[PDB]
A = this chain, B = another copy of it.
Amino acid sequence: SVKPQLVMFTGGRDSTLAACYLMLQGIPVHLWSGNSGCSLHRGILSHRVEEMKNRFGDLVVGHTVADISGAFRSIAIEALEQDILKYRKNLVLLGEKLAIHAHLVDFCRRNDINTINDGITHYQMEFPEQRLVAKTFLMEMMAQYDINYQSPVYEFAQSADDVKYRLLQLGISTKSLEGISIFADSFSTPSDDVVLAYLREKAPLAHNIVNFLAGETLNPPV
């Protein structure tokens, strides 16, 4: 009876908690994992999915693992020289998150989902993908396609410990059982100005990829 909603699920405590918190309210979640082609040691994810099935059962409506390596490549890797020389910062993981959201427009339109959720946390704002400026941009982007983008644990998680102890109360382990990006700890921290400028520069390519995945064009952005 309650409409399923999607959660950007990595196996991390934060996205785990976000999905659990929605399920506690009786909201079924479709777990969606993006594989960008550069993630290491992803196997342990299935241990985490198992914990969640054991705790909520029917509310976990599914787990989709999507190959997003192509969109990721086009947005964030193809122009890596130009990108780094311009911004002075490796913003590959911010690119990855834009690739995730381009794929999710297509996914949502094709599976009748209109609410997506991630586990971006306040305590991790030092990462581009989790800054308010990135979040605000991506909400606007998703709203252009009539998709509601929410971050259910964003305000609450002021520290790692907060998320951990809430997971423990659910009988779920407190560890982040997710793969590591080969790009982990390969960047310095960017300013907000830089985060927003990267996003606005890559946005045309992201919307173009949406258009392609919908079968509406094959031609590049103008």
Where the two chains meet, the residues of A that have a C-beta atom closer than 8 Å to any C-beta of B are 17, 21-26, 37-41, 43-44, 47, 66-67, 69-74, 77-81, 84-85, 88-90, 92, 153, 156, 161-162, 165-178, 180, 182-183, 185-188, 209, 212-220
Contact = CB atoms under 8 A, between A and B. Distances in A.
A174 to B, nearest CB: 6
Contacts of A174: 40-41, 180
Contact of A81 (B22, B38, B89, B220): B89
Give the number of copies in the complex. 7
A44 B47 contact: yes
B24 A171 contact: no
Given A66-B171, A175-B175, 19 more contacts: A25-B216, A37-B38, A40-B174, A44-B47, A44-B177, A70-B167, A70-B170, A73-B165, A77-B183, A80-B187, A81-B88, A81-B89, A81-B186, A84-B90, A156-B218, A161-B185, A162-B220, A169-B213, A175-B176
Nearest to A24: B215
B72 A41 contact: no
